[PDB]
Amino acid sequence: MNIFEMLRIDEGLRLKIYKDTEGYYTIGIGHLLTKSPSLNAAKSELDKAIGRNTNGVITKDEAEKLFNQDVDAAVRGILRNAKLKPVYDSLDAVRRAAAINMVFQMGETGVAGFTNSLRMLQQKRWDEAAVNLAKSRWYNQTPNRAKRVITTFRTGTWDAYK
Ligand SMILES: [Cl-]
Ligand SMILES: [Cl-]
Secondary structure, three states, X not given: OOHHHHHHHHHOOEEEEEEOOOOOEEEEOXXXXXXXXXXXXXXXXXXXXXOOOOOOEOOHHHHHHHHHHHHHHHHHHHHHOOOOHHHHHHOOHHHHHHHHHHHHHHHXXXXXXXXXXXXXXXXXXXXXXXXXXXXXXHHHHOHHHHHHHHHHHHHOOXXXXX
């Protein structure tokens, strides 16, 4: 298991524009297009992202290309963030994947607001971080996904994904 397989499980794959769990136009493996209610706005963002006239549909290779870019961007957003980087550097390889998963889902700014959780993660107080991570809109809106990510931070194993 690795970050790509983990996110592929959590995000799924859909080849036509769809609305994510928040109601936002998305495509592929959780690639958010726009927060705008306008499907034409989404289609225009999609053509822009892919470099051709898609009319709302992309191929599997194209979905995986955006996915690679988004995983890369999530990692790079962690490393450029003064609040995220030192926590990430302190973690083992499996828990680092949980950190990337969170940034991928909610963005650099969102995660960086888990101030108390981040501190507990840096101190390796795993059970306490897990409890604090769960007291969040994140956990209440997407409990099954959030539990899997939290279990990964708690245990440092891939058990929630096997
Ligand atoms: Cl893009
Ligand atoms: Cl969920």
